Design a binder for this molecule. Structure first.
Ligand SMILES: OC[C@H]1O[C@H](O[C@@H]2[C@H](O)[C@@H](O)O[C@H](CO)[C@H]2O)[C@@H](O)[C@@H](O)[C@@H]1O
Ligand SMILES: OC[C@H]1O[C@H](O[C@@H]2[C@H](O)[C@@H](O)O[C@H](CO)[C@H]2O)[C@@H](O)[C@@H](O)[C@@H]1O
Ligand SMILES: OC[C@H]1O[C@H](O[C@@H]2[C@H](O)[C@@H](O)O[C@H](CO)[C@H]2O)[C@@H](O)[C@@H](O)[C@@H]1O
Ligand SMILES: OC[C@H]1O[C@H](O[C@@H]2[C@H](O)[C@@H](O)O[C@H](CO)[C@H]2O)[C@@H](O)[C@@H](O)[C@@H]1O
Ligand SMILES: OC[C@H]1O[C@H](O[C@@H]2[C@H](O)[C@@H](O)O[C@H](CO)[C@H]2O)[C@@H](O)[C@@H](O)[C@@H]1O
Ligand SMILES: OC[C@H]1O[C@H](O)[C@@H](O)[C@@H](O)[C@@H]1O
Ligand SMILES: OC[C@H]1O[C@H](O)[C@@H](O)[C@@H](O)[C@@H]1O
Lengths: 139, 140, 140, 140, 140, 140, 140
């Protein structure tokens, strides 16, 4: 019942997989730096669940939060990254079925335009930086 | 509840405030901010069928904006700018309505939240000299 | 009432005025303003079925705009620029209508209100050499 | 009446004129203007079922525009540029129609009116060397 | 008649032409103009169900444009540029159709007419070396 | 016939060509052109249910574009650039389709035609070294 | 067939490749390109219900883009840039989807094709160091 968007970036970091069965993401936060031009930290909240699921080191000078209504889908989703085994996530642009949008970080090397739908989860690897990030949707 | 609570953004400082009125919605909201500090300093809210002005923070800035909200008019677009961390502050609010009205108060230099939308019902957070933290409240 | 009263913005100065005619609406309004002082100085209003011209302020400014309003035309966008505080003044008005007509008078360098919308019935406030204060009035 | 009179804008100077015909609407209108003075100098009008040209003003300008109006075509947007005061003059006309046709005559540097909309039926004002003052006339 | 005659614009010079066919409409029109004189010089017109080319003027210009018109396609926008006066000339034509097709011929440096609209049925005016004068003709 | 013939624009030179297939529409068209001469030099065409390539002119140009046409896709906009006269040439083609596809080949510096529209069925004209003339063919 | 083959554009060089799966469509496609050479160098494709990655060409470029395609998502706009001739190369791709998604890879300085549209089923062409030749394949 889930669609796994391609994980983009490098092979480094501590693995993460955040997905509650019968739930969807109600809030997502991205943390990035002007110093490295990288995403560093991600936080996620699910419906009817106050717990925050986090990865990465929140050392960046900027963060954006997107709140998602229960009937709201992602209709546009771009992740910017540096490719190769030594790849990092650099940016994210999300647009919703209600015209809400967020833009984090930088888009200077490689891009992926992912699958659309109801955002259910995230998987990847993170340490000091977001090495790699894949979105997960409902089928 | 019958209400959606958007995340409070900013620091942990100042005196807590909650502005909500049983079976009531915001008909008017006022933001005060300074070019000197690039922060919101003061917020004022009025509800439908209630002439009382509910205020928090110190009205010391050189700019103010007021948004009046028709009884049927909703928020379709909402951004709050803030400085993140325990020591944080709310720096700015952009609202757009179901009738093409829009306001821009203060600054959006550090962190942003794109909040939940709907019929604006209340606000909560903390304030003293400054708005330390701000979260919107909507009907279901 | 059968009226919505938008906030009076600006100072407490000048002679009070209320332009409202029972069972009538504003067919014409005129805004006079100066580049010298960047203030509104003078406002005239004509109502439906009334040849009488209601005026307030001193027509001292070097610019004037007139908006004519069709009987079935409403305001869908309204911003008033003003200097806040007791010594305040109303500095500018932008109006847009249900038919794509729009006017822009004066300056928007200090505070702003995005008012209520609807069928413009009347205006209230205070004036002398300048428009000290302006509130719009709409039908429910 | 069965008519709407838009405000005559400009000066008190020149010979008065009123162009209207029983059960007849404007089928054509011409505006003469100069780059040297940036005024309207001359207006001509033809009515439905009437080959007579009604003209006023001194046709001395280096530009002219004609708008032809289909029998079922209305004015949806109408801006007249003018210099305010007793020594005033009409400086420009922008008209936009129900079928997307549009003309621009003259200059818009001092004062503007956005008039009423509808089926153009006549014009009135005063002209000598220049168009001192112009008001539009529409069916109810 | 069953015809609308748009104003003939330009001077009184050259040889008269009138191109119309009973129960027919313009399927093609060609405008020849020059960068040297910034004038139209030559016009050709073909009618529905008729192989004949009706031409007037001197084809001496360095540019031509052709608009082909589908049987159900009307003119929704039509602008003719000209020099006014007895010694006048026709300088350009812009036409836009019910299908989004358009053409621009020549220059719009002096006077302009926004014409009547509808199904293009014919043209009349005067021509010699130049197109002195041009009017359009439409069905009712 | 069951076909509409757009005007052949260009000159009288080259070898004639006519590309049409019984019960067959154009599925692919290629334009070759030079920056050196600012002309079309070569055209290739394929029809529905037919793998043969019909070609004319010499492919000496440094640019090509291909348009592929879905079976239900029509041309809603079509401009051919040319040099007029007996020694004329085809210089450019702009096509826009019912699905928002569009190509632009070559140059539009001298003369233009906006052609008939519909389902492109074939082409005719003449070519040798260059495309001397080109006319489009559509279904009724 | 049940397949529409767009023209393979570019050179005759490289190792031929054909990526198609019986009763399957493309779910992901990656283009790798260089600013140094302004060519595509490498392509990867994944099909519905199939975890295998089909690659061709040499991934030596400094940029990559991935377009993921929803199961019901089609191609409504498709341009490939290329150098024509026996010695040719693919230089760029633009894809636009039924859902407002788009990618742009590489360069468009010489020749273009606007291909057929629909549900993208596969690709074919040749590749070694570079993408010499690319053709898209759609469902009927
Ligand atoms: O710590 C285990 C983890 O370390 C290595 O990845 C890096 C670190 O997590 C940290 O320093 O930050 C780097 C940037 O975020 C990150 O690449 C790898 O050896 C990895 O495989 C391992 O899991
Ligand atoms: O809202 C800001 C801040 O206000 C209050 O703390 C301090 C005092 O108001 C005053 O003495 O000036 C200080 C410098 O601006 C100010 O911090 C408290 O309400 C505090 O908790 C709050 O964060
Ligand atoms: O409208 C502003 C102001 O106008 C009137 O006072 C005027 C000003 O104070 C100043 O221009 O000096 C004038 C000369 O004596 C004076 O009229 C008053 O109506 C005031 O109440 C009003 O605020
Ligand atoms: O159409 C222009 C003009 O053509 C004919 O006379 C011309 C003018 O004298 C002048 O512009 O130069 C021409 C070159 O020899 C000359 O013929 C007449 O038909 C005239 O009435 C017309 O205005
Ligand atoms: O279609 C252009 C032209 O091509 C052929 O003549 C050519 C030109 O004179 C010139 O470019 O030189 C060429 C090679 O030496 C020569 O063939 C003819 O087909 C002619 O009819 C045509 O108009
Ligand atoms: O029209 C401008 C001007 O022209 C003339 O000098 C007279 O007709 C005046 O009465 C008039 O004000
Ligand atoms: O892709 C460029 C080039 O790469 C290799 O050298 C071979 O497969 C060639 O035939 C090809 O043209």
């Amino acid at each position: 019942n889930y669609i796994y968007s391609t994980e983009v970036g490098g092979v480094g970091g501590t693995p993460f997989t955040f997905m509650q069965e019968s739930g969807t993401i109600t809030s997502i936060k991205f943390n990035w730096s002007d110093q490295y031009k990288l995403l560093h930290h991600i936080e996620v909240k699910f419906i009817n669940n106050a717990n925050i699921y986090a990865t990465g080191d929140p050392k960046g000078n900027h963060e954006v939060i997107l709140e998602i209504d229960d009937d709201e889908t992602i209709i546009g989703s771009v992740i910017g990254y540096k490719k190769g085994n030594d790849g990092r996530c650099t940016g994210v642009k999300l647009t919703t079925s209600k015209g809400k949008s967020i833009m984090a970080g930088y888009f200077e090397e490689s891009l992926i335009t992912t699958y659309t739908g109801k955002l259910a989860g995230i998987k990847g690897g993170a340490g000091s930086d977001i090495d790699r990030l894949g979105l997960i949707f409902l089928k």
